[PDB]
Coordinates of C-alpha atoms (C1' of nucleotides) and ligand atoms in Angstrom, one line a residue:
Chain A
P7 CA 28.5 -67.7 -31.7
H8 CA 26.8 -64.5 -30.4
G9 CA 30.0 -62.6 -30.5
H10 CA 32.1 -61.5 -27.5
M11 CA 30.1 -60.8 -24.4
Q12 CA 31.0 -57.3 -23.4
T13 CA 29.3 -57.5 -19.9
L14 CA 29.0 -60.3 -17.4
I15 CA 26.2 -60.1 -15.0
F16 CA 26.6 -62.4 -12.0
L17 CA 23.2 -63.1 -10.7
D18 CA 21.7 -64.8 -7.7
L19 CA 18.2 -65.2 -6.4
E20 CA 17.0 -66.1 -2.9
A21 CA 13.5 -67.5 -3.0
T22 CA 10.8 -69.2 -1.0
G23 CA 11.9 -72.7 -1.8
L24 CA 13.2 -75.3 -4.2
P25 CA 11.8 -75.8 -7.7
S26 CA 9.3 -78.6 -6.8
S27 CA 7.5 -76.1 -4.6
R28 CA 7.0 -73.5 -7.4
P29 CA 9.1 -70.9 -5.5
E30 CA 8.9 -67.1 -5.6
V31 CA 11.8 -64.7 -5.5
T32 CA 12.6 -63.0 -2.2
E33 CA 15.9 -61.3 -3.1
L34 CA 17.8 -60.7 -6.2
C35 CA 21.3 -59.4 -6.8
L36 CA 23.1 -58.4 -10.0
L37 CA 26.8 -57.6 -10.3
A38 CA 27.7 -56.2 -13.7
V39 CA 31.4 -56.5 -14.6
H40 CA 32.9 -55.5 -17.9
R41 CA 35.0 -58.1 -19.7
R42 CA 37.9 -55.6 -19.6
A43 CA 37.6 -55.3 -15.8
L44 CA 37.6 -59.1 -15.6
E45 CA 40.5 -60.0 -17.8
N46 CA 42.5 -57.3 -16.0
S50 CA 46.6 -66.8 -10.8
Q51 CA 49.1 -66.8 -7.9
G52 CA 50.4 -70.2 -6.6
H53 CA 48.7 -72.7 -4.2
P54 CA 46.5 -71.8 -2.9
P55 CA 46.0 -68.6 -4.8
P56 CA 44.7 -65.6 -2.7
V57 CA 41.0 -64.9 -3.0
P58 CA 40.8 -62.4 -6.0
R59 CA 39.8 -58.9 -5.2
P60 CA 36.7 -57.9 -7.1
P61 CA 37.3 -55.5 -10.0
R62 CA 37.4 -51.8 -9.0
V63 CA 34.8 -51.0 -11.6
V64 CA 31.5 -52.8 -11.0
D65 CA 27.8 -52.0 -10.9
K66 CA 25.8 -53.7 -8.2
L67 CA 22.1 -54.1 -7.5
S68 CA 20.5 -55.8 -4.5
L69 CA 16.8 -55.8 -3.8
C70 CA 14.8 -57.7 -1.2
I71 CA 11.3 -58.7 -2.5
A72 CA 7.9 -59.5 -1.0
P73 CA 6.9 -62.9 -2.3
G74 CA 3.3 -63.9 -3.1
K75 CA 3.4 -66.9 -0.9
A76 CA 5.2 -67.7 2.4
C77 CA 8.8 -68.9 2.5
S78 CA 9.3 -72.6 3.1
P79 CA 10.8 -73.0 6.5
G80 CA 14.1 -74.3 5.0
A81 CA 14.4 -71.2 2.8
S82 CA 13.8 -68.8 5.7
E83 CA 16.5 -70.4 7.8
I84 CA 19.1 -70.2 5.0
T85 CA 18.2 -66.7 3.8
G86 CA 17.1 -64.9 7.0
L87 CA 14.1 -63.7 4.9
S88 CA 10.4 -64.2 5.5
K89 CA 7.2 -63.0 3.8
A90 CA 6.1 -61.2 7.0
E91 CA 9.3 -59.1 7.4
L92 CA 9.7 -58.2 3.8
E93 CA 6.2 -56.7 3.9
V94 CA 6.4 -55.2 7.4
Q95 CA 9.5 -53.5 6.1
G96 CA 7.6 -52.4 3.0
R97 CA 9.3 -54.4 0.3
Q98 CA 7.3 -54.5 -2.9
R99 CA 6.5 -57.3 -5.2
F100 CA 8.2 -58.4 -8.3
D101 CA 6.2 -55.7 -10.2
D102 CA 6.3 -53.6 -13.3
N103 CA 8.7 -51.1 -11.8
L104 CA 11.2 -53.7 -10.8
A105 CA 11.5 -54.4 -14.5
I106 CA 11.9 -50.7 -15.2
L107 CA 14.6 -50.7 -12.6
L108 CA 16.3 -53.8 -14.1
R109 CA 15.8 -52.3 -17.5
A110 CA 17.5 -49.1 -16.5
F111 CA 20.3 -51.1 -14.8
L112 CA 20.8 -53.3 -17.8
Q113 CA 20.7 -50.2 -19.9
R114 CA 24.0 -48.9 -18.4
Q115 CA 25.8 -52.1 -19.4
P116 CA 27.3 -52.4 -22.9
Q117 CA 25.7 -55.2 -24.9
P118 CA 25.7 -58.0 -25.3
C119 CA 25.2 -58.7 -21.6
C120 CA 25.3 -62.3 -20.4
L121 CA 23.8 -63.3 -17.1
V122 CA 25.9 -65.8 -15.1
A123 CA 24.3 -67.9 -12.3
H124 CA 25.4 -71.0 -10.5
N125 CA 23.0 -73.8 -11.4
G126 CA 21.2 -71.0 -13.3
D127 CA 20.0 -73.3 -16.1
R128 CA 18.0 -75.3 -13.5
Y129 CA 17.3 -72.6 -10.9
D130 CA 17.8 -68.9 -11.3
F131 CA 17.1 -68.5 -15.1
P132 CA 13.8 -70.4 -15.3
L133 CA 12.8 -68.9 -12.0
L134 CA 13.4 -65.3 -13.2
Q135 CA 11.6 -66.1 -16.5
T136 CA 8.6 -67.3 -14.6
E137 CA 8.5 -64.3 -12.4
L138 CA 8.8 -61.9 -15.4
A139 CA 6.1 -63.7 -17.4
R140 CA 3.7 -62.6 -14.7
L141 CA 3.9 -59.1 -15.9
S142 CA 2.0 -56.8 -18.3
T143 CA 5.3 -55.0 -18.7
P144 CA 7.6 -56.5 -21.4
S145 CA 10.6 -58.5 -20.1
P146 CA 13.8 -56.4 -20.0
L147 CA 16.0 -59.5 -20.6
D148 CA 14.8 -60.6 -24.1
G149 CA 18.0 -59.1 -25.6
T150 CA 20.4 -60.6 -23.0
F151 CA 22.1 -63.9 -22.7
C152 CA 22.9 -66.4 -20.0
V153 CA 25.1 -69.3 -19.0
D154 CA 25.6 -71.7 -16.1
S155 CA 28.8 -71.3 -14.0
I156 CA 28.8 -75.0 -13.0
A157 CA 29.3 -76.1 -16.6
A158 CA 31.9 -73.3 -16.9
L159 CA 34.0 -74.4 -13.9
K160 CA 33.7 -78.2 -14.8
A161 CA 35.5 -77.3 -18.0
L162 CA 38.0 -75.0 -16.4
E163 CA 38.9 -77.4 -13.6
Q164 CA 39.3 -80.1 -16.2
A165 CA 42.6 -78.3 -17.0
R174 CA 33.8 -87.3 -8.5
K175 CA 34.1 -83.6 -7.3
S176 CA 31.2 -81.6 -6.1
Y177 CA 30.4 -78.5 -8.1
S178 CA 28.2 -76.7 -5.6
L179 CA 29.2 -73.0 -5.0
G180 CA 31.0 -73.6 -1.7
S181 CA 32.6 -76.9 -2.7
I182 CA 34.3 -75.2 -5.6
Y183 CA 35.2 -72.0 -3.7
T184 CA 36.8 -73.8 -0.8
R185 CA 38.6 -76.1 -3.2
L186 CA 40.2 -73.3 -5.1
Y187 CA 41.0 -71.0 -2.3
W188 CA 41.0 -73.3 0.8
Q189 CA 38.7 -70.7 2.5
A190 CA 35.1 -71.0 3.4
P191 CA 32.9 -68.5 1.5
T192 CA 32.3 -65.2 3.4
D193 CA 28.5 -65.0 3.3
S194 CA 26.3 -67.9 2.2
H195 CA 23.0 -66.5 3.4
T196 CA 22.3 -63.5 1.1
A197 CA 21.9 -63.0 -2.6
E198 CA 24.8 -60.6 -2.6
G199 CA 27.0 -63.0 -0.6
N200 CA 26.4 -65.8 -3.2
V201 CA 27.1 -63.5 -6.1
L202 CA 30.4 -62.4 -4.5
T203 CA 31.4 -66.1 -4.0
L204 CA 30.3 -66.8 -7.6
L205 CA 32.5 -63.8 -8.7
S206 CA 35.6 -65.2 -7.0
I207 CA 35.4 -68.6 -8.6
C208 CA 35.0 -67.0 -12.0
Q209 CA 38.1 -64.9 -11.4
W210 CA 40.2 -68.0 -10.8
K211 CA 40.9 -68.2 -14.6
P212 CA 39.5 -65.0 -16.0
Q213 CA 40.9 -65.5 -19.4
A214 CA 39.7 -69.1 -19.9
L215 CA 36.3 -68.4 -18.4
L216 CA 35.3 -65.5 -20.6
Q217 CA 36.4 -67.6 -23.5
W218 CA 34.1 -70.3 -22.2
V219 CA 31.3 -67.9 -21.6
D220 CA 31.6 -66.6 -25.2
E221 CA 31.2 -70.1 -26.7
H222 CA 28.2 -71.1 -24.5
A223 CA 26.3 -67.8 -24.2
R224 CA 22.6 -68.6 -24.9
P225 CA 19.6 -66.3 -25.4
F226 CA 17.5 -65.8 -22.3
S227 CA 14.3 -65.4 -24.3
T228 CA 14.4 -69.1 -24.9
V229 CA 15.1 -70.1 -21.4
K230 CA 11.8 -71.5 -20.4
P231 CA 9.9 -70.8 -17.2
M232 CA 10.4 -73.0 -14.1
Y233 CA 6.7 -73.3 -14.0
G234 CA 3.2 -71.9 -14.8
Chain B
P7 CA 8.1 -31.9 10.8
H8 CA 7.3 -33.3 7.4
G9 CA 6.1 -36.4 9.0
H10 CA 7.9 -39.7 9.2
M11 CA 10.6 -40.7 6.8
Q12 CA 9.9 -44.3 5.9
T13 CA 13.2 -45.0 4.1
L14 CA 16.6 -44.0 5.3
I15 CA 18.7 -44.1 2.1
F16 CA 22.4 -43.9 3.1
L17 CA 24.2 -42.2 0.2
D18 CA 27.8 -41.7 -0.8
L19 CA 29.4 -40.2 -3.9
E20 CA 32.9 -40.5 -5.2
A21 CA 33.9 -37.7 -7.7
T22 CA 36.7 -36.0 -9.6
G23 CA 37.8 -33.8 -6.7
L24 CA 36.6 -31.2 -4.2
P25 CA 33.9 -28.5 -4.5
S26 CA 36.3 -25.7 -5.6
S27 CA 37.2 -27.9 -8.5
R28 CA 33.7 -28.1 -10.1
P29 CA 33.6 -31.9 -9.4
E30 CA 31.8 -34.6 -11.4
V31 CA 30.4 -37.8 -9.8
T32 CA 32.3 -41.0 -10.7
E33 CA 30.6 -43.5 -8.4
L34 CA 27.4 -43.6 -6.5
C35 CA 26.0 -45.9 -3.8
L36 CA 22.6 -46.0 -2.2
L37 CA 21.7 -48.3 0.5
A38 CA 18.0 -48.1 1.3
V39 CA 16.7 -49.1 4.7
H40 CA 13.5 -49.1 6.6
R41 CA 13.1 -47.5 10.1
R42 CA 12.1 -51.0 11.3
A43 CA 15.4 -52.6 10.6
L44 CA 16.7 -50.6 13.5
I49 CA 21.7 -53.9 21.9
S50 CA 25.4 -54.5 22.0
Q51 CA 27.6 -56.4 24.2
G52 CA 31.3 -56.2 24.7
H53 CA 34.3 -53.9 24.6
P54 CA 35.3 -52.4 22.4
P55 CA 31.7 -52.4 21.1
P56 CA 31.3 -54.8 18.2
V57 CA 30.9 -53.4 14.7
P58 CA 27.2 -54.2 14.2
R59 CA 25.6 -56.2 11.5
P60 CA 23.9 -54.4 8.6
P61 CA 20.2 -55.3 8.9
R62 CA 19.0 -58.2 6.9
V63 CA 16.5 -56.4 4.6
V64 CA 18.2 -53.8 2.5
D65 CA 18.2 -52.5 -1.0
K66 CA 21.6 -51.6 -2.4
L67 CA 22.6 -49.8 -5.5
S68 CA 26.2 -49.1 -6.5
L69 CA 27.1 -47.6 -9.9
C70 CA 30.3 -46.4 -11.5
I71 CA 29.7 -43.3 -13.6
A72 CA 31.9 -41.7 -16.2
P73 CA 32.7 -38.0 -15.6
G74 CA 33.3 -35.5 -18.5
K75 CA 36.6 -34.3 -16.9
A76 CA 39.7 -36.0 -15.5
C77 CA 39.8 -37.1 -11.9
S78 CA 42.2 -34.9 -9.9
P79 CA 45.2 -36.9 -8.7
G80 CA 43.9 -36.9 -5.2
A81 CA 40.5 -38.3 -6.2
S82 CA 42.2 -41.0 -8.2
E83 CA 44.5 -41.8 -5.2
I84 CA 41.6 -42.2 -2.9
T85 CA 39.3 -44.2 -5.1
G86 CA 41.5 -46.0 -7.7
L87 CA 39.1 -44.7 -10.4
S88 CA 40.2 -42.7 -13.4
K89 CA 38.2 -41.2 -16.3
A90 CA 40.1 -43.3 -18.8
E91 CA 39.5 -46.6 -17.0
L92 CA 35.8 -45.8 -16.5
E93 CA 35.7 -45.1 -20.2
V94 CA 37.5 -48.3 -21.1
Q95 CA 34.8 -50.3 -19.4
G96 CA 32.2 -48.2 -21.2
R97 CA 30.7 -46.7 -18.1
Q98 CA 28.0 -44.3 -19.0
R99 CA 27.6 -40.7 -18.0
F100 CA 25.3 -39.2 -15.4
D101 CA 22.3 -39.2 -17.9
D102 CA 18.6 -39.5 -18.1
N103 CA 18.4 -43.3 -17.8
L104 CA 20.4 -43.0 -14.5
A105 CA 17.7 -40.7 -13.2
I106 CA 15.0 -43.2 -14.4
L107 CA 17.0 -45.9 -12.6
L108 CA 17.2 -43.9 -9.4
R109 CA 13.6 -42.9 -9.9
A110 CA 12.7 -46.6 -10.1
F111 CA 15.1 -47.6 -7.2
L112 CA 13.5 -45.0 -5.0
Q113 CA 10.0 -45.9 -6.2
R114 CA 10.6 -49.4 -4.6
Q115 CA 11.0 -47.6 -1.3
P116 CA 8.3 -46.8 1.2
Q117 CA 7.7 -43.1 1.2
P118 CA 8.7 -40.6 2.3
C119 CA 12.4 -41.1 1.5
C120 CA 15.4 -39.4 3.3
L121 CA 18.9 -39.5 2.0
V122 CA 21.6 -39.5 4.7
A123 CA 25.2 -38.6 3.7
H124 CA 28.3 -37.6 5.6
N125 CA 28.9 -33.9 5.0
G126 CA 26.0 -34.1 2.5
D127 CA 24.7 -30.7 3.4
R128 CA 28.1 -29.4 2.2
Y129 CA 29.2 -31.9 -0.5
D130 CA 27.0 -34.8 -1.7
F131 CA 23.6 -33.2 -1.8
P132 CA 24.6 -30.0 -3.6
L133 CA 26.7 -32.0 -6.0
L134 CA 23.9 -34.4 -6.7
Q135 CA 21.6 -31.4 -7.4
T136 CA 24.1 -30.1 -10.0
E137 CA 24.5 -33.5 -11.7
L138 CA 20.7 -33.7 -12.0
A139 CA 20.2 -30.2 -13.2
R140 CA 22.3 -30.9 -16.3
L141 CA 19.9 -33.2 -18.1
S142 CA 16.7 -33.4 -20.0
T143 CA 14.9 -35.5 -17.3
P144 CA 13.2 -34.2 -14.2
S145 CA 15.0 -34.9 -11.0
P146 CA 14.0 -38.2 -9.2
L147 CA 14.9 -36.5 -6.0
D148 CA 12.5 -33.6 -6.5
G149 CA 10.2 -35.3 -3.9
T150 CA 13.0 -36.6 -1.7
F151 CA 14.4 -35.4 1.5
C152 CA 18.0 -35.1 3.0
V153 CA 19.9 -34.8 6.2
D154 CA 23.6 -34.7 7.0
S155 CA 25.1 -37.4 9.2
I156 CA 27.7 -35.0 10.7
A157 CA 25.2 -32.7 12.4
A158 CA 23.3 -35.8 13.4
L159 CA 26.3 -37.5 15.0
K160 CA 27.4 -34.3 16.7
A161 CA 24.2 -34.1 18.8
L162 CA 24.1 -37.8 19.7
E163 CA 27.7 -37.9 20.9
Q164 CA 27.4 -34.6 22.7
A165 CA 24.7 -36.3 24.9
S166 CA 26.7 -39.2 26.3
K175 CA 36.7 -34.2 18.3
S176 CA 37.1 -35.0 14.6
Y177 CA 33.9 -35.8 12.7
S178 CA 35.4 -37.2 9.6
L179 CA 33.8 -40.5 8.6
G180 CA 36.8 -42.6 9.7
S181 CA 37.5 -40.7 12.9
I182 CA 34.0 -41.3 14.2
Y183 CA 34.1 -45.0 13.2
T184 CA 37.5 -45.9 14.6
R185 CA 36.5 -44.0 17.8
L186 CA 33.2 -45.9 18.4
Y187 CA 34.6 -49.2 17.2
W188 CA 38.4 -49.2 17.5
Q189 CA 38.8 -50.6 14.1
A190 CA 39.7 -49.0 10.8
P191 CA 36.8 -48.8 8.4
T192 CA 36.6 -51.9 6.1
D193 CA 36.9 -49.9 2.9
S194 CA 37.4 -46.2 2.4
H195 CA 38.2 -46.4 -1.4
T196 CA 34.7 -47.0 -2.7
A197 CA 31.2 -45.4 -2.4
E198 CA 29.7 -48.6 -1.0
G199 CA 32.5 -48.8 1.6
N200 CA 31.7 -45.3 2.8
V201 CA 28.0 -46.1 2.9
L202 CA 28.7 -49.2 5.0
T203 CA 31.0 -47.3 7.3
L204 CA 28.3 -44.6 7.5
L205 CA 25.7 -47.3 8.1
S206 CA 27.6 -48.8 11.1
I207 CA 28.0 -45.4 12.6
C208 CA 24.3 -44.7 12.4
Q209 CA 23.7 -48.0 14.2
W210 CA 25.7 -47.0 17.3
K211 CA 22.5 -45.5 18.8
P212 CA 19.8 -46.0 16.1
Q213 CA 16.9 -45.1 18.4
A214 CA 18.2 -41.6 19.0
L215 CA 19.7 -41.5 15.5
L216 CA 16.3 -41.8 14.1
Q217 CA 14.6 -39.6 16.7
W218 CA 17.2 -37.1 15.7
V219 CA 16.6 -37.4 11.9
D220 CA 12.8 -37.2 11.7
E221 CA 13.1 -33.9 13.5
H222 CA 15.6 -32.6 11.0
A223 CA 14.9 -34.0 7.5
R224 CA 14.6 -31.3 4.8
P225 CA 13.9 -31.0 1.1
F226 CA 16.4 -31.9 -1.5
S227 CA 14.9 -29.5 -4.0
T228 CA 15.7 -26.7 -1.7
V229 CA 19.3 -27.9 -2.0
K230 CA 21.3 -25.4 -3.9
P231 CA 23.5 -26.8 -6.6
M232 CA 27.2 -27.0 -5.6
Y233 CA 27.8 -25.1 -8.8
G234 CA 27.3 -24.8 -12.5
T235 CA 23.9 -25.0 -14.2
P236 CA 26.1 -24.6 -17.3
Chain C
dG1 C1' 36.0 -28.6 9.2
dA2 C1' 35.1 -31.9 5.8
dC3 C1' 33.9 -33.6 1.5
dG4 C1' 37.1 -36.1 -3.6
Chain D
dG1 C1' 23.6 -83.1 -8.9
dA2 C1' 22.2 -78.8 -7.2
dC3 C1' 19.3 -74.6 -6.6
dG4 C1' 16.0 -72.2 -1.8
Ligands
MG301 MG1 22.1 -69.6 -5.9
MG302 MG1 31.6 -39.2 1.3

DNA sequence: GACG
DNA sequence: GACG
């Protein structure tokens, strides 16, 4: 299809609200894993996988343009006030230099992985990038939704939210459901359930991020 | 003295070995924090929570020489396994990245590292000297958490990272195998008495471009 | 020492 | 659904 994805980038965004509200990103986290590190499961239940030794990790809190919805502030512990008080910058030109440089240290093709990404994280990110005079640093990178991926894996009435899956696989509640990094780590663990099968699935379904259309605007 | 450092960037490096060995960085973690983000109830005193708003960067870096057996034992990293997963080298992009990471910080910026005055800071300087790019740390500052933690404790035996932690908190550090683990350990330590901590560190911050390279300038 |  |  687009060849074997050499790097998986688990991605999660915290933001000001749900899609209907035209949300802005308050926190982003990327965790780049090499396929090799990934294809590097137990019995029942299997232990929670340890993450690979070799990973690159990025986590940035971000001052949004508009205030957080009350619901989003309670879930994330983030507000427009504090991100600005504490001097967080906008989703600006730099941030894309930063992402660019971070993406630059991953062997291509890179494929972004997000949970409900096709509905939420991907179109959100696209929107936020579109706002920039800078060129997007993701044009060359691919993406895929982990919900689709795990529906297929688990096939070998269920909820497919992040926590429903995680608890189901490992019979443990996820560690941190309130930060971008927490959600990425939970995401990573469900994707390590069947590393072999999943990377195969990711390779078949990888899709260009350039196409992903904006949530809004 | 230099003014107020806006960002405390806790820093830790893993590497091929110790200073005598001419060591190369293999992993790097920065956790950037704002002076704002800085009580406790119970015994032994709880391991505090990292603050909510933080920027975190953690990168694996391929070194041009093999990891000494002791560095591999500590970190579980090896040159060949970094290279499998096509980790890059400490190059110009990296500096751009760090540049950009630091440029998202409120200035001025002060690195804090455990033994940095003797290991991380001079080593970082060496890594940055090797390449085409200007250093991103040319305008950055530095302080050692050992010296800092000395004072603060002497106003209330070993000062290895773990010894301080286990002693304040009565738990083993969560992870001593990775750069982020050490940054987080270092972070919790610096939250024992953050008020003073930061009192202590705005009095002491110093240039990083005064930092002499551990070695080399090949 | 204390850092890998 | 499921994302904040
Ligand atoms: Mg999410
Ligand atoms: Mg250290």
